[PDB]
Design a protein around this ligand. Structure first.
Ligand SMILES: COc1cccc2[nH]c(C(=O)N[C@@H](CC(C)C)C(=O)N[C@@H](C[C@@H]3CCNC3=O)C(=O)COP(=O)(O)O)cc12
Ligand SMILES: COc1cccc2[nH]c(C(=O)N[C@@H](CC(C)C)C(=O)N[C@@H](C[C@@H]3CCNC3=O)C(=O)COP(=O)(O)O)cc12
Lengths: 299, 299
């Protein structure tokens, strides 16, 4: 049981390279539109406090150079939706999969296709933390890389990458240009709210540990939902809802461990620690696996 | 720092399914040849102790159903190479990338595209252990899934999946059909050799830490290679090779820390312990990042 990303071929066929002036980043080419972060129009001066509608009315179609591999697409239009620039081109991408723009909830996961200069570099799995950051791996030139899920040949795009906080975590927008969290596309050191642990995902990952024949953390005891949430909130874990309990049903049915039983296990793990032992190789409680993540891998 | 797979699109376009009787597994379609595990020709009463040579003589080209999606590709030739079947087909795969077949060393990492009935399911990075096993995530129907590295648009295929040992780790061959490690393609419980820690990768991980300003573990001593290797084996660490010293070159030059000085630093860490202090946020030493992996995620 490992962190597993969706195959990235369908998104790879859409990554292009967008240049305005002296700056370059990645864009997403679907049908005849290219989507990219709008601060690609900005200069070193502008970046500190950009008045984007002002900067954009002064740009022309010919100020944008879009490259798909070695061929250049001609831009025939440009508009701005929140933080994303939409560049119309005179060519439809034949590799455009069935797709949808969606806004992810905190706790949900997606695959990130890291790109540099319109070339895909790597793929890995991330979760939207409760404080609307993600713990990614991105360098200079990765802006415009997207996050996505795949559901029966439909690619749901949910993330476009914009910045790296001083603490080394990452921030970005949905494909409608709206940031996840309180961040802004201006060149400033920004801080996020206090992060908390995704409780439903820790539980799913304990269930995963048992599906793979590991059980040392189990115990005989049980807890009520409310009493687990009291201890949980004490340790900066998100609350567990009855919806979460329902979602975990399959995992409980498969292993024969009721949810509130597994909660009693996690409570004791929080109150006492791991005592040097490890779960699925990890020395810390993992919270970047959704219950759907677990079932899809184990079956 | 994240475990990061290569983008999987060039390999996705090469995945097909190969059916003999009622057993279906995955195959790899490059130019006009399909590669797959030979035990696809086995019946459930044959897998215990197959006579592959005798089994193959009774097979004809029309006993083999090769499908890209639900589209059939006609088999026009067949032959066996160690444990892989090679099926010549009547169509050259137009999505064939520039490619190589290569045999990796323990410690090297690679990306696995987990496939079922010729359809990609997921992608993740594995390291080849010193006992020639990989810590995979595979279900029934996964045999013939391949592992690969991509360097400058050329795909180097290094693994084809065959087996899950009773301990839950996995085993397979290179693309010429030679098993990694002492295993055989028969339906029997086989045991891996005792595993050890991949020393070259731990050192890579120490260089990563230094690059990020975490360097308390650096010391004023050096060692000879042989002296380090003798000590390393007493701690269940792999001995260093001359090639290992060579692939630490870039990290050594970038940090100004000589390889044998970093060995002396690691050697003190083995004799004395971490004393509660951490490295890159952790109390255990990571051994599944290669020196190329570190260079990739730092630059
Ligand atoms: C003084 O201000 C600061 C103080 C302290 C911390 C700070 N952090 C940022 C920031 O992150 N700024 C965004 C651009 C703003 C305008 C939204 C950025 O730099 N994004 C990168 C991806 C980043 C690059 C490194 N790792 C990534 O993930 C692009 O890809 C585009 O820029 P490039 O063309 O590649 O250089 C500003 C800042
Ligand atoms: C009774 O003997 C045993 C005792 C104890 C442990 C044992 N383990 C194996 C084994 O692994 N046997 C190979 C068959 C070959 C080696 C002849 C196999 O089962 N390979 C799977 C991949 C596996 C499936 C689950 N997770 C994977 O990685 C395929 O994909 C092909 O088989 P399928 O037709 O797809 O089911 C036999 C065995």
């Amino acid at each position: 049981f490992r962190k597993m990303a969706f195959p990235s071929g369908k998104v790879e066929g859409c990554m292009v390279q967008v240049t305005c002036g002296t700056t370059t980043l990645n864009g997403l080419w679907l049908d005849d539109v290219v989507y990219c972060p709008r601060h690609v129009i900005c200069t070193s001066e502008d970046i500190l406090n950009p008045n984007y509608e002002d900067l954009l009315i002064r740009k022309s179609n010919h100020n944008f150079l879009v490259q798909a591999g070695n061929v250049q697409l001609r831009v025939i239009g440009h508009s701005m939706q929140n933080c994303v620039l939409k560049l119309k081109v005179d060519t439809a991408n034949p590799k455009t999969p069935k797709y949808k723009f969606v806004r992810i909830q905190p706790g949900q996961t997606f695959s990130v296709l890291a790109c540099y200069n319109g070339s895909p570099s790597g793929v890995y799995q991330c979760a939207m933390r409760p404080n609307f950051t993600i713990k990614g791996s991105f360098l200079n030139g990765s802006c415009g890389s997207v996050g996505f899920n795949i559901d029966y040949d439909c690619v749901s795009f949910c993330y476009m990458h914009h910045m790296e906080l001083p603490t080394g975590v990452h921030a970005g927008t949905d494909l409608e240009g709206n940031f996840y969290g309180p961040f802004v596309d201006r060149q400033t050191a920004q801080a996020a709210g206090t992060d908390t642990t995704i409780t439903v995902n820790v539980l799913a990952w304990l269930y995963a540990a048992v599906i793979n024949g590991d059980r040392w953390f189990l115990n005989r005891f049980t807890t009520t939902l409310n009493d687990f949430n009291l201890v949980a909130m004490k340790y900066n874990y998100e609350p567990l809802t009855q919806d979460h309990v329902d979602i975990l049903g399959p995992l409980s049915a498969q292993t024969g461990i009721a949810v509130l039983d597994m909660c009693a296990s996690l409570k004791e793990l929080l109150q006492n620690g791991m005592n040097g032992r490890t779960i699925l190789g990890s020395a810390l409680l993992e919270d970047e696996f959704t219950p759907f993540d677990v079932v899809r891998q184990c079956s």
